């Protein structure tokens, strides 16, 4: 009908853990996103959580620039009351059932963006308990998920695959209470997923798990999972191709154009896992 593009599903990922911004880089970012969002980030206590809650932004303000074609100094996004980023109704938007979700955990951020389908993200990596067993780590998890979900979990030989498989499960969750909307009273024992195959290669996306929400067959979801690494799990959780895309910082800049003036207060102000011993948890 029109010259021009129609917006397909985004899938993003960033490696905001191996990310090294120079001064100049980082003060330039923060410059790049709204006010209130700046002052988010300078909360956090660690580079590494102010690096990712960073990424995330500017994934999202490219995202909509890029696809929606709204100017970045234009783009306008808000929060729910649950604190969910959300783009504002009042448009530049030809997608009515345009919707994104965000999701950080380990070395990535990623993001996931659809034009019409309802979307959630979640993003785990597998680690070793960072206090007690893993036996003990399953046992503190064990109302979560459902006899047949243990069992799965349960049916290898080593322990290692055992935890791998259970983020996995426990990513496929939350993608879909992150999808949704719930947040955090949800019954998780609610949902048990079918997970299918039961081994994933890295980099490949799958679209075979199934949802079964009180115990009927969510035949309106479906989930494709993708290892980005070899110890971070992606599911994405999608209402009625898909290979995530690792960008760098020069991707994320794109279109990105200074919103405030340079804040120099946000140098020097997070602390470095470098100078701590890692205990307990990762801190
Ligand atoms: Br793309
Ligand atoms: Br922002
Ligand atoms: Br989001
Ligand atoms: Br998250
Ligand atoms: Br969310
Ligand atoms: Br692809
Ligand atoms: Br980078
Ligand atoms: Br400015
Ligand atoms: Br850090």
Redesign the pocket.
């Known amino acids: 009908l029109y010259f021009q593009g129609h917006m397909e599903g985004v899938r993003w990922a960033f490696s905001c853990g191996t990310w090294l911004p120079s001064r100049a880089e980082w003060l330039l970012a923060v410059?790049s996103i709204q006010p209130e969002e700046k002052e988010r980030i300078g909360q956090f206590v660690f580079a590494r959580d102010a690096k990712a809650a960073m990424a995330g932004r500017l994934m999202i303000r490219k995202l909509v620039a890029e696809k929606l074609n709204i100017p970045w100094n234009h783009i306008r996004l808000q929060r729910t009351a649950k604190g969910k980023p959300v783009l504002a109704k009042d448009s530049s938007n030809p997608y009515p059932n345009f919707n994104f979700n965000i999701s950080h955990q380990g070395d990535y951020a990623v993001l996931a963006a659809e034009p019409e389908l309802q979307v959630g993200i979640d993003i785990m990596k597998t680690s070793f308990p960072g206090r007690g067993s893993i036996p003990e780590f399953f046992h503190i998890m064990k109302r979560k998920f459902t006899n047949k979900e243990w069992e799965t979990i349960r049916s290898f030989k080593d322990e290692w695959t055992q935890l791998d498989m259970f983020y996995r499960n426990w990513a496929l969750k939350e993608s879909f209470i992150k999808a949704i909307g719930v947040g955090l009273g949800f019954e998780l024992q609610r949902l048990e997923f079918d997970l299918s195959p039961l081994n994933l290669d890295i980099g490949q996306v799958y679209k075979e798990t199934r949802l079964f929400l009180d115990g009927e067959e969510e035949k309106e979801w479906a989930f494709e999972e993708s290892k980005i690494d070899e110890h971070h799990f992606v599911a994405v959780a999608l209402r009625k191709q898909r290979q995530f895309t690792i960008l760098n910082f020069n991707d994320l800049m794109s279109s990105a154009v200074?919103?405030?003036?340079e804040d120099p207060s946000f140098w020097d102000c997070f602390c470095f896992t470098e100078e701590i011993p890692i205990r307990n948890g990762t801190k």
Request: glycine share 0%; net charge positive; proline share 40%.
């Open positions: 410059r200074p919103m405030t003036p």
